[PDB]
Amino acid sequence: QALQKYSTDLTARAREGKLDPVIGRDNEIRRVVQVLSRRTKNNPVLIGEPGVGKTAIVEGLAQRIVAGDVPESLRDKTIVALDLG
Amino acid sequence: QALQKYSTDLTARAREGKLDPVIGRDNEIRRVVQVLSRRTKNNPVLIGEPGVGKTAIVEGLAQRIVAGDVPESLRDKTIVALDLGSMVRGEFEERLKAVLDDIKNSAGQIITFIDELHTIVGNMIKPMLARGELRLVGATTLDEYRKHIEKDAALERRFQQVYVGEPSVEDTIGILRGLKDRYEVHHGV
Amino acid sequence: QALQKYSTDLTARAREGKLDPVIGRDNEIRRVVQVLSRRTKNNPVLIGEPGVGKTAIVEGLAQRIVAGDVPESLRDKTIVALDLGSMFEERLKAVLDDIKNSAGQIITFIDELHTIVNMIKPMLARGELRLVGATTLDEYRKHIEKDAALERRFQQVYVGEPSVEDTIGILRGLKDRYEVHHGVRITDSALVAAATLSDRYITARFLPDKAIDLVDEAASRLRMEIDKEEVGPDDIADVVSAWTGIPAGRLLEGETAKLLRMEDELGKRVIGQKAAVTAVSDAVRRSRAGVSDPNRPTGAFMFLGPTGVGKTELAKALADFLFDDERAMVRIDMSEYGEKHTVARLIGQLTEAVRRRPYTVVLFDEIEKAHPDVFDVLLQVLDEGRLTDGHGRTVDFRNTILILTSNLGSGGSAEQVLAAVRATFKPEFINRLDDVLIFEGLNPEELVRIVDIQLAQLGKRLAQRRLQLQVSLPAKRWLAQRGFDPVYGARPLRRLVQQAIGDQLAKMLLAGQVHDGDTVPVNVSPDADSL
Amino acid sequence: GPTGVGKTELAKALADFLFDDERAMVRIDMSEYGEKHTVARLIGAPPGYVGYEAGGQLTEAVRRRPYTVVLFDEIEKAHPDVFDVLLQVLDEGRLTDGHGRTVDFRNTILILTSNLGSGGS
Amino acid sequence: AAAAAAAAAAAAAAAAAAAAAAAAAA
Numbered sequence A: 001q002a003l004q005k006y007s008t009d010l011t012a013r014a015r016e017g018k019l020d021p022v023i024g025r026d027n028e029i030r031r032v033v034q035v036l037s038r039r040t041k042n043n044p045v046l047i048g049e050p051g052v053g054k055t056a057i058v059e060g061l062a063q064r065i066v067a068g069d070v071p072e073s074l075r076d077k078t079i080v081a082l083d084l085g
Numbered sequence B: 001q002a003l004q005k006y007s008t009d010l011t012a013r014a015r016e017g018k019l020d021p022v023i024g025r026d027n028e029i030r031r032v033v034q035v036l037s038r039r040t041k042n043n044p045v046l047i048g049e050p051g052v053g054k055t056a057i058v059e060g061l062a063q064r065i066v067a068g069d070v071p072e073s074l075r076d077k078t079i080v081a082l083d084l085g086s087m088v089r090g091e092f093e094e095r096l097k098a099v100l101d102d103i104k105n106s107a108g109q110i111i112t113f114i115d116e117l118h119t120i121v122g123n124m125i126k127p128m129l130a131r132g133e134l135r136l137v138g139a140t141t142l143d144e145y146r147k148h149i150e151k152d153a154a155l156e157r158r159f160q161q162v163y164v165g166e167p168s169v170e171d172t173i174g175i176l177r178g179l180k181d182r183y184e185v186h187h188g189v
Numbered sequence C: 001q002a003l004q005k006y007s008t009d010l011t012a013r014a015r016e017g018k019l020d021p022v023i024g025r026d027n028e029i030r031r032v033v034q035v036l037s038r039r040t041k042n043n044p045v046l047i048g049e050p051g052v053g054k055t056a057i058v059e060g061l062a063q064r065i066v067a068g069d070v071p072e073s074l075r076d077k078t079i080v081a082l083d084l085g086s087m088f089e090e091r092l093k094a095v096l097d098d099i100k101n102s103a104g105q106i107i108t109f110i111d112e113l114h115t116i117v118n119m120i121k122p123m124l125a126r127g128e129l130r131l132v133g134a135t136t137l138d139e140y141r142k143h144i145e146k147d148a149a150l151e152r153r154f155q156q157v158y159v160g161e162p163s164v165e166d167t168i169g170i171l172r173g174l175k176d177r178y179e180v181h182h183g184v185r186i187t188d189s190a191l192v193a194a195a196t197l198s199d200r201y202i203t204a205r206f207l208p209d210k211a212i213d214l215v216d217e218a219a220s221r222l223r224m225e226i227d228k229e230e231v232g233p234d235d236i237a238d239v240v241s242a243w244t245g246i247p248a249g250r251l252l253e254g255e256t257a258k259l260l261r262m263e264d265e266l267g268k269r270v271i272g273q274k275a276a277v278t279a280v281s282d283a284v285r286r287s288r289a290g291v292s293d294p295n296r297p298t299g300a301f302m303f304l305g306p307t308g309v310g311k312t313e314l315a316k317a318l319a320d321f322l323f324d325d326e327r328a329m330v331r332i333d334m335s336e337y338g339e340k341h342t343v344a345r346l347i348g349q350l351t352e353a354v355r356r357r358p359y360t361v362v363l364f365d366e367i368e369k370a371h372p373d374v375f376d377v378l379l380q381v382l383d384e385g386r387l388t389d390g391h392g393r394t395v396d397f398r399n400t401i402l403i404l405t406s407n408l409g410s411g412g413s414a415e416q417v418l419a420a421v422r423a424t425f426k427p428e429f430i431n432r433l434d435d436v437l438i439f440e441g442l443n444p445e446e447l448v449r450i451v452d453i454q455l456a457q458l459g460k461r462l463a464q465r466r467l468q469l470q471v472s473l474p475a476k477r478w479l480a481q482r483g484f485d486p487v488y489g490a491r492p493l494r495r496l497v498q499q500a501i502g503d504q505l506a507k508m509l510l511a512g513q514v515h516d517g518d519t520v521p522v523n524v525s526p527d528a529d530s531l
Numbered sequence D: 001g002p003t004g005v006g007k008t009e010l011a012k013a014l015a016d017f018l019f020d021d022e023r024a025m026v027r028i029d030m031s032e033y034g035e036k037h038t039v040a041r042l043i044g045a046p047p048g049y050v051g052y053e054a055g056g057q058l059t060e061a062v063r064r065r066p067y068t069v070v071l072f073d074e075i076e077k078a079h080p081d082v083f084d085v086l087l088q089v090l091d092e093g094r095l096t097d098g099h100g101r102t103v104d105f106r107n108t109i110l111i112l113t114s115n116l117g118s119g120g121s
Numbered sequence E: 001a002a003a004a005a006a007a008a009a010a011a012a013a014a015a016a017a018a019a020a021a022a023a024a025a026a
């Protein structure tokens, strides 16, 4: 019952439709996905300059997970946005 | 109903005549209402010197709402003001998090207000800020805007600058002859 | 009506008449009735000192209220003081309860409202009470100088002590109060001179109540010395002069005792500077007799001189004479004072050194190491109040004297020296000090007594092991060849005293043979002086 | 004119009449500007060198208090790299300092003094 | 019949630093 009062849920927030119609960036999506499913040390960082859509990539990953266009070992994986504030 | 205790309500005091007139200045309200109906980069901050009428801009906006002149997107939406002077390590964050209760529980477009927002800042409001349920109307002064929310900003892309400099003397004469009979109330000569 | 057990009242006391005779403070009531009768920016705050009688200001206000002269917005107002020593907010619901039904007719009066700042602030901004209060300026800042959410509904009214004449002539209502113990007739001449003799314990105290404090402590010391049914002005003088008094020290006017001579200790310690002797005697005669000005330090001069003249020794020669202690001076080593960041550390360092000791003459030797922001701090000291600091607890520089001994224009005789002097005074350092004097360096007649002081010092160093010296005048003038050099100064003389005598004495003293109880004579040689 | 006459006393007699102060005038001394390198020391030129924190010896008195009365003590010795800098003041009421600001002189008062007047009236 | 159980605390206040800003001296 811990990670339901200190965290949202972008997957259940996408079932309603409260996200954006993301378009584009095919290379960086797979650049994230092929890193997120390696064996050990499997965590990326989206480094960029401010304003180029470093959040829309993760929302597009959420829509690609909900839709069903992922590789094999990413079935129904329920991504969660935490905070520390 | 539970957290409307440690704040005030400018909208509730509209139907009692507690607020002064706003005579002059029919342009900053149009600027603020033009901001406050947008989609992104909403919630403006009034920037100006102390003792000009930023509070008067908010109060004239409230009177113009409770008569009914704003567009339909902002129709029948009450405005609360919030407190900073009775706040203060620790326990300011928890009092903040307790304030955010009815803000979340309102589930509407109940517009808040903060006086002197440079004092408060940063990371405790931005995931709540970039979602679209609160309308953080503020009020600061220019070199305090430069001091806090340009140095420790980190979320500066989500505020606006509505410059209110000062009324000149010839406008002030018409203002003070307009704001005349309120001191025929108390003493009266 | 449930507030009687939580608060006092000021409506039945004045109708009874248990009130002091209020004298003065008519303009204060003139401000209070005015500011209280306002539509906005009303209900002020009385700022004074701790121990003025702002309480009694409100008492006389209630006395004029029950008399009846007031305007419309002050219809007798039935004011109530709240108990400060009776509180958390589990009673304060009922405390403000009898303020809710009030129509602004039971306006209250809190004391020291900086401890109130969540509970009373919506009631303040609503318009059913006013809540006049009274704090102190330094504590008026620190709580409520940085919190401008409610710095609009409070207006300061600065009040101080009354004048000296009214404070002395107000003591005719004091003729009953404290004296219950054994009853001596406090004489009118003792009464009119009692508050006159005020700064003879300390001047850091204030006028009104501290006059009665000196009177009470003096009557205590009197009737515990004589265990007479009368007093005397000399008797209360040396009775007040008991605690901070050596055998009471510097009793009456006293310029005849210690201040006319002024140079028997000075001229015997520093030899020369005769024009400086006469001029600084005249300068202390006009300055520290209170016939200079109002609130200056009033001691403010400058003279000059190169190295070896004794610019450090001449300052310390009067440290143990002016206020007769080693702690009776202050100087600064400004080597860390060069920019606008060194200003932010003493405004502090000097402030607590004057707060502990309101006792010290100040010494600023050189000027070429002085960052120019320090001067504008110092210009506010002269003729512009005392000084400020970081917190606000200021100290008035009532017994301080500013001295400048700089070698700025050592090549200039009359013209070039004053031309360089005038240029380095940024504003207002010239006409606000007084006249500038010239050094009188190493001279053949004024050279002997220096050697006398140094040989007395060396005899002090040798008297522990019971050895002493006999020094003749031919050796004393043999040293005068390598002791004159009027550019660098008398410091190679002080070195050569320990050079020529010291190594011979040290060689003889460690190998026996100069056994204790023996004396040592001097024996002149053209280059050495053997023993 | 001569010395000790009341020469600067006339300036303070009008520094309080129109400028309401005794601390209104800011005098300087032009008895140091006789070398060709110390001419810019009154205004302080570059960002990065010795005089930048101290600022201009003329300009830092008028950037704040823009209502002074300037007095030039003994103008008649200084090098003629001052005179064009003195002239451009009364060409347009502006003078660009070392930081980069533009300081207005168009409502101040200039006074130049000299000590001739020994023999000839 | 309960107790008091005096709890602990933690304090923090950081430090500053200065910069020197050399001058090219010509």
Ligand SMILES: Nc1ncnc2c1ncn2[C@@H]1O[C@H](COP(=O)(O)OP(=O)(O)OP(O)(O)=S)[C@@H](O)[C@H]1O
Pocket (backbone or CB within 6 Å): A020, A021, A022, A023, A024, A025, A049, A050, A051, A052, A053, A054, A055, A056, B157
């Ligand atoms: N491929 C995309 N499809 C749709 N909208 C996009 C796309 N890329 C960017 N955007 C929009 O660009 C904006 C990006 O907003 P954010 O990514 O949240 O801010 P940011 O670009 O990350 O910069 P910061 O550092 O977060 S303030 C949003 O309005 C997105 O809708």
Ligand SMILES: Nc1ncnc2c1ncn2[C@@H]1O[C@H](COP(=O)(O)OP(=O)(O)OP(O)(O)=S)[C@@H](O)[C@H]1O
Pocket (backbone or CB within 6 Å): B020, B021, B022, B023, B024, B025, B049, B050, B051, B052, B053, B054, B055, B056, B175, B179
């Ligand atoms: N256009 C206006 N019409 C009527 N009153 C005005 C107008 N502009 C200013 N005022 C008055 O100016 C006074 C200033 O009050 P505030 O607006 O609270 O001060 P402020 O300008 O908000 O600065 P702060 O917030 O107190 S630091 C009030 O008495 C207002 O009634």
Ligand SMILES: Nc1ncnc2c1ncn2[C@@H]1O[C@H](COP(=O)(O)OP(=O)(O)OP(O)(O)=S)[C@@H](O)[C@H]1O
Pocket (backbone or CB within 6 Å): C269, C270, C271, C272, C306, C307, C308, C309, C310, C311, C312, C313, C314, C450, C490, C491, C494
């Ligand atoms: N007129 C004098 N009377 C007494 N001692 C003197 C006199 N002139 C010099 N001296 C002594 O000469 C020595 C010089 O020490 P200082 O007082 O430090 O000299 P100074 O004039 O202050 O120059 P500096 O800057 O301190 S080296 C001390 O031992 C003084 O006591």
Ligand SMILES: Nc1ncnc2c1ncn2[C@@H]1O[C@H](COP(=O)(O)OP(=O)(O)O)[C@@H](O)[C@H]1O
Pocket (backbone or CB within 6 Å): C020, C021, C022, C023, C024, C025, C048, C049, C050, C051, C052, C053, C054, C055, C056, C057, C208, C209
């Ligand atoms: N004008 C005055 N009239 C009568 N008494 C005064 C007056 N000024 C001071 N006092 C004396 O001072 C006392 C009141 O001081 P108070 O107001 O308590 O000082 P503070 O308010 O600084 O604590 C009274 O007892 C009174 O004798």
Ligand SMILES: Nc1ncnc2c1ncn2[C@@H]1O[C@H](COP(=O)(O)OP(=O)(O)O)[C@@H](O)[C@H]1O
Pocket (backbone or CB within 6 Å): D002, D003, D004, D005, D006, D007, D008, D009
């Ligand atoms: N005409 C004058 N009126 C008033 N004071 C004068 C006059 N002339 C000289 N003084 C005295 O001289 C001082 C000012 O002299 P100042 O004008 O500086 O002379 P100068 O400018 O020629 O050097 C004042 O302190 C004043 O005491």
